[PDB]
Amino acid sequence: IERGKFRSLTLVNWNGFFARTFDLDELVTTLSGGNGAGKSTTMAAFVTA
Amino acid sequence: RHFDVARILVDQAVRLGVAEADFSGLPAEWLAINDYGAKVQAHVIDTY
Amino acid sequence: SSKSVANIIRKTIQREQNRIRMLNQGLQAVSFGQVRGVRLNVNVRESHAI
Ligand SMILES: Nc1ncnc2c1ncn2[C@@H]1O[C@H](COP(=O)(O)OP(=O)(O)OP(=O)(O)O)[C@@H](O)[C@H]1O
Ligand SMILES: [Mg+2]
Question: Please, after which residues is chain B broken with C–N above 2.5 Å?
Fold first, then answer.
């Protein structure tokens, strides 16, 4: 009961992200932006962490 | 319709300059923008 | 025979380089994301020039 949750993700001094924090949704978080916006970059930050 | 509005407005707003506070390292808060529980997280857009 | 070989390869390479370089100007700064233009670079390999 009471599954642990990932609350937030922080990027520091990356290409395009000097300092950016995203508040992770409990159910679904949806990145949206044009090609090259850097969404793949964000998932990369996650997984590398 | 509110959602379909919010999105569009943001699409129009983010093309207009940037927010200087975003380089301060201080995260912005989730300000409520209506009843029923809608929230937004964005710094003020200062630098046009 | 070796000299002649080297010569013909050199000529062929030059011709093709020129043709490709002329072709390159068939592109007009395409807009894709942060990509603003596409180009083909052709260059004889020094490792092979030797
Ligand atoms: N290792 C890298 N070296 C140089 N530029 C990179 C690198 N990784 C990403 N970029 C650039 O950073 C920007 C963000 O790329 P990214 O693919 O994350 O964007 P996107 O909008 O999420 O698109 P996609 O839907 O393809 O993931 C693009 O300009 C990409 O070319
Ligand atoms: Mg991406």
Answer: none
Asked whether the beta carbons of B33 and B39 are under 8 A apart, the reply is yes
State whether A34 and C33 contact (CB < 8 Å): yes
Q: Which ligand is nearest to the CA of A35?
A: 1
- CA dist B39 and B43 (Å) reads 13
The CA distance from C50 to C44, in Å, is 11
Q: Which of A41, C16, A18 is nearest to B20 (CA)?
A: A18
Q: CB B23 to CB A23 under 8 A?
A: no
Residue pair A9/A42 in contact (Cβ under 8 Å)? The answer is yes
Q: How far apart (Å, rounded) are the C-alpha atoms in residues A15 and A45? A: 11
CB atoms within 10 A of CB A42: 20
Neighbours of C42 (CB within 10 A): 13
Q: To one decimal place, what's the resolution in Å?
A: 6.3
What does residue A15 show for φ and ψ, rounded to 5 degrees? -55, 110
Tell me if A15 is assigned to a ligand binding site.
Answer: no
